[PDB]
Amino acid sequence: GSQILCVGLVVLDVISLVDKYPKEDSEIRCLSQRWQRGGNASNSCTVLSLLGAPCAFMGSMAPGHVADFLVADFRRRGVDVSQVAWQSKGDTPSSCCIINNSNGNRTIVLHDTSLPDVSATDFEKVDLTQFKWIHIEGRNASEQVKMLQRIDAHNTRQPPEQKIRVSVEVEKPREELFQLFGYGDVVFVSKDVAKHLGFQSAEEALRGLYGRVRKGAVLVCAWAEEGADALGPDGKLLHSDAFPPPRVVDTLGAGDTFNASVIFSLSQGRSVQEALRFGCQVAGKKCGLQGFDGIV
Amino acid sequence: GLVPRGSQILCVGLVVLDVISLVDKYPKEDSEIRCLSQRWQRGGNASNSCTVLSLLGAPCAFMGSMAPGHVADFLVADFRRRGVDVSQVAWQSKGDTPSSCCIINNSNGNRTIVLHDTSLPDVSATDFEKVDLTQFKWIHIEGRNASEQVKMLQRIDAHNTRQPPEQKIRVSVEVEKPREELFQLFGYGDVVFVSKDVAKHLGFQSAEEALRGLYGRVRKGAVLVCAWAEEGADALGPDGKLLHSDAFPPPRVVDTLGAGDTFNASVIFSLSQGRSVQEALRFGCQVAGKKCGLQGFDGIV
Ligand SMILES: Nc1ncnc2c1ncn2[C@@H]1O[C@H](COP(=O)(O)OP(=O)(O)NP(=O)(O)O)[C@@H](O)[C@H]1O
Ligand SMILES: Nc1ncnc2c1ncn2[C@@H]1O[C@H](COP(=O)(O)OP(=O)(O)NP(=O)(O)O)[C@@H](O)[C@H]1O
Ligand SMILES: OC[C@H]1O[C@](O)(CO)[C@@H](O)[C@@H]1O
């Protein structure tokens, strides 16, 4: 039971690096271009792998040349893809990403290809004895709340020394997803969500939202160059300053780098304070680099 | 496979992967949005022209630069989907196969474009030296790296000097961007296409103005051609007689991207079949006008 599993989206990121964001109805040349395997859960596996944690990914992919690229990338990272929910309806999602090389800003135009989401049916088919931690990227809530319950069930049946740790990401300001707050030992909530609920800082968001998590859970809110905060059962607010690189050149996947790093640190036994900090340390480092290579 | 002597039309130029996203509204910097639709397309002038030539029923080949990879794979498969011979591609060990990002605003039609990077080397004159020409009856060059392309043209001229009239390779050139370096290309080719956009930048306000004002720059005996959107197109040859065809407006205008390339390929095709310049202008306007009412190149027949 020593593999981390991330459940969520995997998409092909077609990326252009520009030195200024283009005004509407204008035309500008890009400095360079590349393809990356992206999606939150997928980006997190990249990071876990680079950190040395055996991990595996689970999500929908449609057979094709794109998927072939993605799988190859997964494999080069040593990510287990065996639990992938292969399909026959829909395309694999992709996006156009513009990365502003002058400040690391990233603009994402996303194509969700109707590809049907992973289901409780698919999940129930998974040998949970393989995993020390399961992270779930909040997408199809009603169908994921089910997967969560299945995980609780498995836990109710296990020595505390052998329970599967669970984390949840709530990233889009979307009603259906809020039911997810109520599950998992660790809950990640985004600045975008927090702002959409009227909160103007990580600390205010944590106070405002801790009521929604389940007893014993740690709530976590990262906030870009403000670093990140966390709040546990004891009611003590925890904070970490960011580690901004002198030149921020690419923030695409910083959030996923942070989540992966917190999970890793926690799974390794560290305190929440220490994990917050390691999360920022690794995410800040990634912001100084194009892509993920070399955060290690 | 075996390609019969003097059977193919070659187009030398750019091929690019265009990623096209339709959106409700232009994305603000550092935001994430869902598009209404997104499309991968093969683009580029020489590339577009090859597609049209194939649909017209001509054997045709593309020569341009690519680098091994998944972008080139998509592009090669799309070429072949259109019956284009890719065996003359100049494969590169350095650089990125061109790809461009285009964002189309659905609620005002605007197009915001991030152009491909500059990393890939253009086809060089030494690259072109290695090509056996006997295969081709017509070679068309999209003006890009002009100093190198001038050498390619001189090489074609040398080949022709030694041939009987019935095995001379016909040559055409396109000058599509207003850049001074490209202008030396006017001096090569039996047929020179100049775009309205270049004409305008030089200060000409019509096709008639452009042809009379630029004809001086072409080599003796050459035909100079200029299409002008809804005004159709003109041509001027050595006999000094300005030739013209009106446009053939379609029931409604759906997509004019690549109309110029459709026009170019169609004129080349017609002339390659031995039609008169006047017949070719007309045919070019008919095919391109038809194309303006269709999305893409399907059904231009
Ligand atoms: N400009 C920055 N400087 C330093 N650290 C940063 C910066 N932006 C993000 N980080 C770090 O990454 C964490 C998450 O930031 P966040 O703004 O949620 O990332 P994100 O860019 O939204 N990820 P993504 O959705 O792929 O773009 C922050 O808590 C910091 O640790
Ligand atoms: N709006 C139109 N209606 C009819 N025919 C058109 C139209 N636009 C272009 N064409 C035809 O396409 C030929 C080439 O026109 P050209 O101006 O080079 O097109 P383009 O620059 O590729 N696209 P656009 O600038 O939007 O017209 C013209 O000579 C016409 O035959
Ligand atoms: O939401 C989809 C997008 O979000 C990211 O995962 C960034 O976290 C990109 O890789 C992907 O295109």
Q: What is the DSSP string of A146-201?
A: HHHHHHHHHHTTS-GGGPPEEEEEE-S--GGGGGGGGSSSEEEE-HHHHHHTT--S
Could you tell me the domains of chain A? 1-296 (3.40.1190.20)
* Partner-chain contact B29 A35, CB within 8 Å: no
Alpha carbon distance A137, B41 (integer Å): 32
Number of separate helices (H) and strands (E) present in chain B: 8, 15
| Interface check A24 vs B, CB under 8 A | yes
Alpha carbon distance A41, A7 (integer Å): 6
Alpha carbon distance A261, A40 (integer Å): 13
**Assigned token pair, B196:** 């309205």
CA nearest ligand 2 atom 27, residue? B229
Ligand 2 binding pocket includes B227 (Cβ within 6 Å)? yes
Number of separate helices (H) and strands (E) present in chain A: 8, 15
Q: Which of B136, B140, B131 is nearest to B167 (CA)?
A: B136
Q: How was this structure determined?
A: X-ray
Ligand 2 binding pocket includes B232 (Cβ within 6 Å)? yes
Alpha carbon distance A211, A196 (integer Å): 17
Out of A22, A32, A111, the one facing B35 most closely (by C-beta) is: A111
Ligand 2 binding pocket includes B292 (Cβ within 6 Å)? yes
Plot region of B6 (φ>0 → left; ψ -120 to 50 → alpha; else → beta)? left
Q: Please give the resolution of this entry in Å, rounded to 1 decimal.
A: 2.3
Query: Can you say whether the dihedral through the CA atoms of B190, B193, B198, B203 is positive or negative?
Result: positive
Phi (first) and psi of residue B153, to 5 degrees: -60, -45
Q: Which DSSP helix (H) or strand (E) runs through A237?
A: strand A237-240
Residues of A at the annotated binding site for ATP? 106, 224-227, 253-256
Distance of residue A192 Cα from the nearest chain B Cα, in angstroms: 10
User: Residue B13 carries which side chain, given as an amino acid letter?
Assistant: G
Sequence length of chain A is 296
For chains A and B, count residue pairs whose Cβ atoms are closer than 8 Å: 95
Specify whether the CB–CB gap between B237 and B277 falls below 8 A.
Answer: yes
Positions of E strands within chain B: 8-12, 16-23, 32-34, 37-43, 60-63, 65-66, 90-91, 99-105, 111-115, 136-142, 170-175, 191-194, 223-227, 233-236, 242-245
Q: Which DSSP helix (H) or strand (E) runs through B187?
A: none
Contacts of B57 (CB under 8 A, 6+ apart): none
